[PDB]
Each structure stands twice: as structure tokens, then as C-alpha cells.
Design goal:
The protein contains four helices and three strands, in the order H-H-E-E-E-H-H. It is mostly helical and 129 residues long. It has a three-stranded antiparallel β-sheet. The PDB classes it as hydrolase.
Length: 129
Amino acid sequence: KVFGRCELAAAMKRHGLDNYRGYSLGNWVCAAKFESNFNTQATNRNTDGSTDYGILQINSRWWCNDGRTPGSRNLCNIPCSALLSSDITASVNCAKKIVSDGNGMNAWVAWRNRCKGTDVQAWIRGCRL
């Protein structure tokens, strides 16, 4: 599923991401835009052989099991394919664990380089939230 901007904002708000660990909704929508272009089916292979999955490009090195990242963990206790669902619940619940891990949303390179320090509430303007 390819979300609309406001559709995703509303879905993330219902799942509790607005102000989660102090990150306003616009931060999360901005990260999803640049990680996956709002496409829940996005996958990308990394140099170390891990793969990023889903709307927030969560990595198999640490967070989910895809059966092909040797010596990786599965800290969200999910198959990585669960992160590709049109239902974003699994991605959101895993993202909550990631952003609580000490480094905040700096865990998302796209957020650091393209959202951090910008007018992120632009990503939710005009939406009926």
C-alpha cells in the first residue's frame, strides 16, 4: 500500500506516534516519506547483507527476522515480512522500540539528513487530524 501523506499521518496518530518520546507527528511522516516514499512494501538491501523493510525501513540486523541475516537479532520479535503489511501496526510498534533505544530518531538516517532541523510540521499541514 502506498499511503497518502494525510492518510499516513492519521494512521500514525491513531497508533500513538504523535509526540511519542517527544517526536511530533510531522517527524514520523517526514521519515516515512524519505525512507519508503510512503510505500509499505519497500525493501532495500544493505552493504552488510541486512535488509530494510517497510514504511519505516526497519533493519533486519537488529529488529526483525528475515532468515538471511546471519548473527542478527530480532528485537521486535517479528518476521520482517510483517513490516510490509498494509496494516502499519507492526511497523509502528517496532518503531516505538527503536526510538526508545537511546538514539531517538537518529536511528533513521533519512530522518537525520532530511527531516531533523527542518519544518517537519509542514508534513502534516492541511490534514484533518
